Amino acid sequence: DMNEAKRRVRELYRAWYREVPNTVHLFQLDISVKQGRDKVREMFMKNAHVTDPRVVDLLVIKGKMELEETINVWKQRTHIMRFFHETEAP
Amino acid sequence: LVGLAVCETPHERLKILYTKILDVLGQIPKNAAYRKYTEQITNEKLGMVKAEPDVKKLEEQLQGGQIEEVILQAENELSLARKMLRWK
Amino acid sequence: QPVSEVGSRVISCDGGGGALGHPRVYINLDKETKTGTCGYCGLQFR
Amino acid sequence: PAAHGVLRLVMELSGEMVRKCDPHIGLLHRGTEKLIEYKTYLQALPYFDRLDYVSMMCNEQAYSLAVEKLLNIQPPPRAQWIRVLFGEITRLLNHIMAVTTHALDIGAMTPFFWMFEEREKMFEFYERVSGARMHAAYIRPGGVHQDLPLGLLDDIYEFSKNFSFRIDELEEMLTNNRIWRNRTVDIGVVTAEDALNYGFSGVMLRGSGIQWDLRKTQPYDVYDQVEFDVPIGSRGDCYDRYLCRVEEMRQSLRIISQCLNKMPPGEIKVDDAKVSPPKRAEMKTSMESLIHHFKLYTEGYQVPPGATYTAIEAPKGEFGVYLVSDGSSRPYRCKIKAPGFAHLAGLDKMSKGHMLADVVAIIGTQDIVFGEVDR
Amino acid sequence: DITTLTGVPEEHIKTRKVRIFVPARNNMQSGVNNTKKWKMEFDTRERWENPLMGWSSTADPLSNLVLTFSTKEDAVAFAEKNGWSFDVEERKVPKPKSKSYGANFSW
Amino acid sequence: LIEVFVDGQSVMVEPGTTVLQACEKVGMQIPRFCYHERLSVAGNCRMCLVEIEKAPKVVAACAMPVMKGWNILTNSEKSKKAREGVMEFLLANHPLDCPICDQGGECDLQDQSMMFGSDRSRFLEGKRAVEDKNIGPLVKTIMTRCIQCTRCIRFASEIAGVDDLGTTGRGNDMQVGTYIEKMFMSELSGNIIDICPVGALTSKPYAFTARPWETRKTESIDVMDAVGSNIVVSTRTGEVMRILPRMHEDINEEWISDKTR
Amino acid sequence: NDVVHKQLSAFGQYVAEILPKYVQQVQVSCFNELEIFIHPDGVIPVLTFLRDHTNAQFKSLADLTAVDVPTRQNRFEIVYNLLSLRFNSRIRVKTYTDELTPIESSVTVYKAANWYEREIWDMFGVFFANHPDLRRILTDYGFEGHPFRKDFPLSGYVELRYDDEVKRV
Ligand code: SF4
Ligand code: SF4
Ligand code: FES
């Protein structure tokens, strides 16, 4: 059931949020240190209407691997800067 | 075989093998045919075990190169039976 | 190119040589009012 | 240079010992299997050369078998003799490349240049029959492409008789060279059963002394009619695998003799025009010929719906094709077993606690090629 | 719904539609084989021309995609699992027809 | 309604109705040319021969109506030898034109040659070939590729209603071309370009422009008329190539106009 | 050969009787390839015995293929080749799976399947339970959508390119 999985995702937000300044530091990202956090919150808003049982936990499975990668310095400046779509024409 | 380790006087260990076999499978209800076949060959092979104190033709008798491995095959069957009833 | 002519009737044009030109095809000559241009070769006949 | 251009083995090394190598393949995942599905059978064949590219012929042979079973069709015998013959010259190619570059990784430098002269002379043969120096899309599902030119077999003879001195001289620079011995003799042993659990294939098995080998075991061609000695290893150290590489080279060199001595006259493509395109002299002068030509190249041949797993003794190990005809002319799914994939999976178990140079040598005994791993 | 699981950009689960149907026989053909079995074609989008060489350069991610099926209900349910907009169309088997060589010779 | 056995299984088939229609009802498909529903049956082009469960000689599938618990082995070997037998005859004269003939992508004759016809040639003489008969702004007659499934005349006399074109002569040299130069214009003249079995009759305006395996085949409806007939428009990437009718019982049924085409 | 078809047939019957809590059917492809079916929950127990002797000493996975098909109540269709050595012969068990149901990992039973779990996970949606470490391989980092999903464009939805204004791909 839901809610049991929502706590998981909150835990995940804690992990991401706290990790972010380390990400900006270690990666030498020049994104505003806030911006990554906000963007995290946004990505968390992207599926903020999913309602199926198993699908959400599956969502935190696919959510683990990314912090799993940034913590291991897997991915890179390019790969993590990728989320901001900054080169796109409006 | 590099992992294979030489084991003198297999026969004793063999008797422990087939006995542990028949015993651990001894809990099988007659229902499933597994007990039937596996006992069928088991007792046959073991019959050869008592029948063949010598090793040099013994492995010409079990029809398996290096009986020294197949004792571990039976060892696999032991944990196999350990699984058979967990599977019910 | 000059238009090739033969007093017979049907002729076969391979485009020059055997197995180095276009697939063998026979150009009919039922109408003398027109030349018999080859399908692939592009060589007229009459 | 030791990473073969496409490996990212990140590892948490200590002072200089490794603690765990962590391979990250996919650095050359060109994405093959998705592409294959959209292209008809005859148009899919080249991908296989593009796979284990060092061993370009045996892959083609693996495929053409994989189709002929589905298609229920048997090559004229001469074709089978070519298919084994170049299967073997390729056997020599991969072993040359393997033993050599494995030496180059540990700095031998020289044997390399002594051998690639020869390897170039072998590419003169792919050059001669296929028209390409390598990636010779020459083996066909129906059997074989063009017949080989008259002037060839004596030429192969003249080379093959003299190659053995070369391999031998190589062996004089290596097998006794006790520096080379010390570097590779206690690494990296794998338990003979533990190999089997990981599904190691080909030489990586024989090094640990298990008897198995597909050419003797489940022969697929005229291997019924060739005689050769499979060289079992013992200790399972890189050194034994090396001697297996060499000895298998000599044995292939035995096979070449027999194939040269029994190479029957006859056709080479299968008679069935529904599958094998008509010869040019014929297609240009009779209707059905031209039509089957046309449809074989337009739509391509259909295959009965079905599924299979063929496997053959590719030099690195068994090469495995699982494919499923939908009945259409485009195969539905074509999973490709890559023997290297399993090996490289087994590596980190095989290489814990070993010195960082030794993991480099041991990558080489795995004789892996990443193009095959990433498929 | 599995929209989050697929990495597909929202644009193409939204502003376009699938168009399930059983394909019509090519009429030049007299054959019937390819006719049967549902397939799940998507709608066409823009495709312009390469300024150089005149190639038909194209933007849309997934124009060429197409999928066979055994039953229509399975297809609709399929797209529903994907959360897809759809345009189901009827199988349109020809009516059986009477034929008679001798009716040609009534009088 | 009579019971009848397609090769094995029983089928409660409609009374009378041709053996062809029976196997059509079980869905197994007999090789065909001259026959065409929405046209008329004819005994020429005996590529439809099939073997009776017991009666020694094969009969045309679209001829004999089924009756009285018949069984029919479509896959019977004698049937197959029959079909190869005929196909070699059809291919004994059809000109080596596949690469240039505009019908080349999907000509039914090709596919029938693949599925059934023996692959080796064993004709070894000289094909007949014949001069063209010019016919109008549209159709590109070539003949020679003609196989005398009369079909097109059965189209003309029975639907277009014009009977200007027709068969001529006997034995070989017999021709489906109309005698006399006179042009054949009609409002259903376009549909024959669809109906024509091979490349013997193909649309001049579209000619050479494209190949069948290429074009995408969108489904829609005509607008030149409010009649609203269903169609398959065909485009070679970013540009329309050719139109074809899409069959629909309420309207066009496999046909289409001509101004729309 | 008739012979092999016989032996595989009888052996298929043999296993069919030995453990029929789950063998849906033991079809023999006529070109000598046996292949029993399995209820998806039943993967571990079958394969386990498949290593375990009776004759089924089929050690070493050859592969862990994952055929896809858009139809069916559950689309993805997993397949396991296997090889026995002393009796030199190959069989091929296989199952089926929902887009969402987590079937268990089979790494312990066949030993050399650790890489495959990761493969099929990143080439498909399907999840294997009791797997020590599923993670992406054969892809880029992010990338997201599984390929080989039988849908999903080969050209994908993305591309990299280097951009000087930001000095980065
Ligand atoms: S159309 Fe006429 S010519 Fe072109 S291929 Fe089919 S049959 Fe041969
Ligand atoms: S016209 Fe069309 S139908 Fe009549 S014969 Fe020539 S090709 Fe066959
Ligand atoms: S349709 Fe039966 S004879 Fe041509």
PDB file of N, CA and C and ligand atoms in Angstrom, chain D residues 287 290-291 294, chain F residues 91 94-111 145-147 197-200 202 211, ligand 1:
ATOM      1  N   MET D 287      14.141 -17.136 -66.745  1.00  0.00           N
ATOM      2  CA  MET D 287      13.238 -16.295 -65.980  1.00  0.00           C
ATOM      3  C   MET D 287      13.252 -16.556 -64.484  1.00  0.00           C
ATOM      4  N   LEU D 290      16.109 -15.225 -62.588  1.00  0.00           N
ATOM      5  CA  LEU D 290      16.095 -13.805 -62.335  1.00  0.00           C
ATOM      6  C   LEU D 290      15.097 -13.446 -61.266  1.00  0.00           C
ATOM      7  N   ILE D 291      13.993 -14.174 -61.216  1.00  0.00           N
ATOM      8  CA  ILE D 291      12.976 -13.831 -60.244  1.00  0.00           C
ATOM      9  C   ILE D 291      13.429 -14.169 -58.837  1.00  0.00           C
ATOM     10  N   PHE D 294      15.805 -11.780 -57.688  1.00  0.00           N
ATOM     11  CA  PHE D 294      15.213 -10.511 -57.371  1.00  0.00           C
ATOM     12  C   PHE D 294      14.606 -10.554 -55.980  1.00  0.00           C
TER      13      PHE D 294
ATOM     14  N   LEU F  91       6.048 -19.120 -66.829  1.00  0.00           N
ATOM     15  CA  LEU F  91       7.347 -18.460 -66.871  1.00  0.00           C
ATOM     16  C   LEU F  91       8.122 -18.802 -68.124  1.00  0.00           C
ATOM     17  N   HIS F  94       7.291 -15.158 -70.066  1.00  0.00           N
ATOM     18  CA  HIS F  94       7.265 -13.830 -69.473  1.00  0.00           C
ATOM     19  C   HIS F  94       8.682 -13.290 -69.440  1.00  0.00           C
ATOM     20  N   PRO F  95       8.898 -12.145 -70.094  1.00  0.00           N
ATOM     21  CA  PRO F  95      10.211 -11.555 -70.347  1.00  0.00           C
ATOM     22  C   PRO F  95      10.976 -11.158 -69.099  1.00  0.00           C
ATOM     23  N   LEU F  96      12.289 -11.317 -69.173  1.00  0.00           N
ATOM     24  CA  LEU F  96      13.184 -10.997 -68.084  1.00  0.00           C
ATOM     25  C   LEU F  96      13.155  -9.516 -67.825  1.00  0.00           C
ATOM     26  N   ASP F  97      12.093  -9.024 -67.212  1.00  0.00           N
ATOM     27  CA  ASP F  97      11.959  -7.588 -67.073  1.00  0.00           C
ATOM     28  C   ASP F  97      11.825  -7.113 -65.661  1.00  0.00           C
ATOM     29  N   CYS F  98      12.071  -7.997 -64.712  1.00  0.00           N
ATOM     30  CA  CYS F  98      11.786  -7.699 -63.327  1.00  0.00           C
ATOM     31  C   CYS F  98      12.440  -6.404 -62.871  1.00  0.00           C
ATOM     32  N   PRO F  99      13.733  -6.222 -63.143  1.00  0.00           N
ATOM     33  CA  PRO F  99      14.293  -4.943 -62.722  1.00  0.00           C
ATOM     34  C   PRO F  99      13.635  -3.704 -63.317  1.00  0.00           C
ATOM     35  N   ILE F 100      13.158  -3.744 -64.551  1.00  0.00           N
ATOM     36  CA  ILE F 100      12.584  -2.529 -65.121  1.00  0.00           C
ATOM     37  C   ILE F 100      11.075  -2.475 -65.039  1.00  0.00           C
ATOM     38  N   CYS F 101      10.420  -3.629 -65.038  1.00  0.00           N
ATOM     39  CA  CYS F 101       8.973  -3.642 -64.967  1.00  0.00           C
ATOM     40  C   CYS F 101       8.519  -2.996 -63.689  1.00  0.00           C
ATOM     41  N   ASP F 102       7.530  -2.127 -63.796  1.00  0.00           N
ATOM     42  CA  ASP F 102       7.206  -1.233 -62.703  1.00  0.00           C
ATOM     43  C   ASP F 102       6.359  -1.972 -61.683  1.00  0.00           C
ATOM     44  N   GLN F 103       5.970  -3.180 -62.045  1.00  0.00           N
ATOM     45  CA  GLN F 103       5.158  -4.013 -61.189  1.00  0.00           C
ATOM     46  C   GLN F 103       6.058  -4.797 -60.258  1.00  0.00           C
ATOM     47  N   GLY F 104       7.357  -4.556 -60.368  1.00  0.00           N
ATOM     48  CA  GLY F 104       8.344  -5.473 -59.840  1.00  0.00           C
ATOM     49  C   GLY F 104       8.327  -5.733 -58.351  1.00  0.00           C
ATOM     50  N   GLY F 105       7.861  -4.775 -57.572  1.00  0.00           N
ATOM     51  CA  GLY F 105       7.897  -4.943 -56.141  1.00  0.00           C
ATOM     52  C   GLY F 105       6.956  -5.987 -55.590  1.00  0.00           C
ATOM     53  N   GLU F 106       5.780  -6.138 -56.191  1.00  0.00           N
ATOM     54  CA  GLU F 106       4.764  -7.002 -55.605  1.00  0.00           C
ATOM     55  C   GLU F 106       3.961  -7.756 -56.639  1.00  0.00           C
ATOM     56  N   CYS F 107       4.498  -7.922 -57.832  1.00  0.00           N
ATOM     57  CA  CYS F 107       3.734  -8.625 -58.833  1.00  0.00           C
ATOM     58  C   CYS F 107       3.427  -9.999 -58.329  1.00  0.00           C
ATOM     59  N   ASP F 108       2.167 -10.379 -58.474  1.00  0.00           N
ATOM     60  CA  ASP F 108       1.673 -11.586 -57.862  1.00  0.00           C
ATOM     61  C   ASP F 108       2.402 -12.740 -58.483  1.00  0.00           C
ATOM     62  N   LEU F 109       2.773 -12.573 -59.740  1.00  0.00           N
ATOM     63  CA  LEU F 109       3.455 -13.627 -60.448  1.00  0.00           C
ATOM     64  C   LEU F 109       4.799 -13.933 -59.808  1.00  0.00           C
ATOM     65  N   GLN F 110       5.459 -12.922 -59.256  1.00  0.00           N
ATOM     66  CA  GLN F 110       6.715 -13.197 -58.581  1.00  0.00           C
ATOM     67  C   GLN F 110       6.469 -14.062 -57.375  1.00  0.00           C
ATOM     68  N   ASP F 111       5.573 -13.628 -56.503  1.00  0.00           N
ATOM     69  CA  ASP F 111       5.381 -14.349 -55.262  1.00  0.00           C
ATOM     70  C   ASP F 111       4.873 -15.756 -55.499  1.00  0.00           C
ATOM     71  N   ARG F 145       4.599  -9.049 -71.325  1.00  0.00           N
ATOM     72  CA  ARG F 145       4.485  -9.498 -69.952  1.00  0.00           C
ATOM     73  C   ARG F 145       3.084 -10.005 -69.726  1.00  0.00           C
ATOM     74  N   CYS F 146       2.245  -9.856 -70.742  1.00  0.00           N
ATOM     75  CA  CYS F 146       0.886 -10.363 -70.689  1.00  0.00           C
ATOM     76  C   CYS F 146       0.847 -11.846 -70.420  1.00  0.00           C
ATOM     77  N   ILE F 147      -0.031 -12.229 -69.514  1.00  0.00           N
ATOM     78  CA  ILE F 147      -0.413 -13.612 -69.373  1.00  0.00           C
ATOM     79  C   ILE F 147      -1.908 -13.603 -69.497  1.00  0.00           C
ATOM     80  N   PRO F 197      -2.833  -8.167 -63.475  1.00  0.00           N
ATOM     81  CA  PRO F 197      -2.144  -9.159 -62.650  1.00  0.00           C
ATOM     82  C   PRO F 197      -0.673  -8.889 -62.544  1.00  0.00           C
ATOM     83  N   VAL F 198      -0.091  -8.385 -63.624  1.00  0.00           N
ATOM     84  CA  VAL F 198       1.345  -8.228 -63.715  1.00  0.00           C
ATOM     85  C   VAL F 198       1.682  -6.791 -64.063  1.00  0.00           C
ATOM     86  N   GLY F 199       2.798  -6.588 -64.744  1.00  0.00           N
ATOM     87  CA  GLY F 199       3.188  -5.263 -65.172  1.00  0.00           C
ATOM     88  C   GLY F 199       2.771  -4.946 -66.582  1.00  0.00           C
ATOM     89  N   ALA F 200       1.944  -5.805 -67.160  1.00  0.00           N
ATOM     90  CA  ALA F 200       1.532  -5.631 -68.543  1.00  0.00           C
ATOM     91  C   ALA F 200       0.754  -4.345 -68.730  1.00  0.00           C
ATOM     92  N   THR F 202       0.503  -0.760 -66.588  1.00  0.00           N
ATOM     93  CA  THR F 202       0.744   0.049 -65.389  1.00  0.00           C
ATOM     94  C   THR F 202       0.740   1.547 -65.644  1.00  0.00           C
ATOM     95  N   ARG F 211       9.156   2.454 -56.035  1.00  0.00           N
ATOM     96  CA  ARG F 211       9.162   1.013 -55.873  1.00  0.00           C
ATOM     97  C   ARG F 211       8.371   0.643 -54.618  1.00  0.00           C
TER      98      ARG F 211
HETATM   99  S1  SF4 H   1       6.169  -7.720 -62.858  1.00  0.00           S
HETATM  100 FE1  SF4 H   1       6.102  -8.949 -64.650  1.00  0.00          FE
HETATM  101  S2  SF4 H   1       8.214  -8.582 -65.000  1.00  0.00           S
HETATM  102 FE2  SF4 H   1       8.281  -7.340 -63.215  1.00  0.00          FE
HETATM  103  S3  SF4 H   1       8.771  -9.092 -62.020  1.00  0.00           S
HETATM  104 FE3  SF4 H   1       6.663  -9.478 -61.677  1.00  0.00          FE
HETATM  105  S4  SF4 H   1       6.586 -10.709 -63.463  1.00  0.00           S
HETATM  106 FE4  SF4 H   1       8.698 -10.336 -63.809  1.00  0.00          FE
END
